[PDB]
Design a protein around this ligand. Structure first.
Ligand SMILES: O[C@@H]1[C@@H](O)[C@H](O[C@@H]2CO[C@@H](O[C@@H]3CO[C@H](O)[C@H](O)[C@H]3O)[C@H](O)[C@H]2O)OC[C@H]1O
Length: 404
């Protein structure tokens, strides 16, 4: 049965990881997790997201392909870093290494880049040109990419050691210093090096920062990352307070001020969507809350964030002509951007790790568990989140500490 009283002691501390699928009475859980990875990282061109990159017939590395029928396929640090995270959780070293080789070679901006704000950060968008060779479309970072790179690399070091192709640990510490120096403002993760007083709630994963703190060696950096963790919880707490009730109706948003205030409308040239939209980025917020509750312990704010968000979506479904909750809401209003897909349902399943409502849990978990693995033109985002969710709900998303 669903544990509707999640511990205030996290799995990171106790070493006790929940198996949510097991709680929900599912069978063949590990088989399903394994097949999910095999399909995503298999040459089937169906669920597949993991693709080899070759140059003049010579194998180089692998990437997660951000398939895009609307603007053309591209390659993203977000998907790359998620791919590495999935690989390390399942002990898939070759897949990890092939993805990390790619990121280091092709996504990393040179340390002597003329723009100091871009030095050593990871170019968020690559494409293959008309001749099949990789190039940077946009050299600017998407800082949740770097966050997951650091997380994945620290775990790779812990699991596999540092004497092979990669010194994962050294790569991880380099990544952390890059986040600290290039991608932070007042110890809150930036949306952009070029904009101040701006964060993206979906980038906040407080448990990662606690993990970072326990895996650096020097006192100053240990304290630095623990402070980042506390400030992130505060940011998320503040954001959820501000979105509670009218006018945001309990869903977190795309963009936020450093005090947790949703960004209203457009604020910069190039902005994809209004700041106050619960859209594609925002899907991940309660997933992250569930992650943090599971790993670092469930507090009152975790439960309130998730219970109220899932509560809204359940309500929104009853007031939808298609009997679904939708992908995009603004001020509690449906924006007609389609019924929830696999990735959103996956994000919402992980959120259940902070839920205290067995009824909610039953509905949201079964909607996710009944899905087939994403295929087709929109599987990049849905498939990536689906993979992460499968790990989270099977007790496979673990923190592996390094030893000193
Ligand atoms: O990098 C991430 C992007 O990959 C992400 O892109 C959005 C993914 O979802 C698309 O909408 C699909 C439309 O068709 C169906 O309804 C699918 O279920 C949807 O996923 C959007 O068009 C893309 O913009 O955005 C978030 C970003 O972090």
């Amino acid at each position: 049965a669903f544990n509707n009283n999640p511990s205030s002691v996290g799995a990171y501390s106790s070493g006790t990881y929940r198996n949510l699928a097991q709680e929900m009475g599912k069978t063949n859980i590990q088989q399903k997790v394994n097949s999910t990875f095999d399909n995503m990282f298999g040459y089937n061109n169906t669920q597949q997201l993991y693709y080899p990159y070759t140059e003049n017939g010579v194998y180089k590395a692998h990437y997660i392909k951000a398939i895009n029928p609307d603007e053309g396929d591209d390659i993203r640090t977000q998907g790359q870093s998620w791919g590495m995270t999935a690989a390390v959780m399942l002990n898939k070293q070759e897949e990890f290494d092939n993805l990390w080789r790619f990121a280091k070679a092709y996504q990393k901006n040179p340390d002597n880049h003329p723009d100091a704000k871009k030095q050593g950060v990871y170019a968020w968008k690559l494409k293959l040109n008309q001749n099949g060779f990789v190039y940077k479309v946009d050299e600017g970072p998407a800082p949740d990419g770097e966050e997951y790179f650091a997380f994945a690399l620290l775990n790779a070091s812990a699991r596999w050691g540092n004497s092979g192709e990669f010194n994962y640990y050294n790569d991880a510490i380099t990544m952390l210093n890059t986040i600290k120096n290039k991608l932070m403002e007042n110890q809150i993760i930036r949306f952009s090096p070029y904009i101040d007083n701006l964060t993206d709630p979906s980038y906040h994963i407080p448990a990662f920062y606690d993990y970072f703190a326990n895996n650096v060696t020097n006192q100053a950096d240990k304290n630095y990352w623990r402070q980042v963790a506390t400030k992130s919880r505060t940011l998320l707490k503040n954001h959820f307070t501000k979105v509670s009730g009218s006018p945001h109706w309990n869903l977190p948003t795309f963009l936020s001020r450093l005090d947790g205030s949703p960004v209203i409308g457009y604020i910069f040239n190039g902005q994809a969507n209004p700041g106050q939209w619960y859209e594609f980025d925002a899907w991940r917020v309660i997933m992250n809350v569930g992650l943090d509750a599971h790993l670092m312990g469930a507090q009152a704010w975790h439960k309130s964030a998730v219970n109220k968000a899932l509560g809204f979506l359940s309500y929104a479904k009853t007031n939808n002509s298609k009997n679904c909750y939708e992908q995009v809401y603004s001020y509690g209003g449906a924006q007609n951007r389609g019924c929830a897909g696999e990735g959103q349902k996956a994000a919402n399943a992980v959120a259940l790790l902070a839920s205290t409502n067995a009824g909610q849990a039953n509905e949201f978990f079964n909607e996710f568990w009944s899905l087939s693995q994403p295929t087709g033109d929109y599987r990049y985002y849905n498939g990536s989140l689906y993979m992460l969710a499968m790990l989270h709900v099977s007790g496979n998303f673990k923190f592996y500490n390094n030893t000193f």
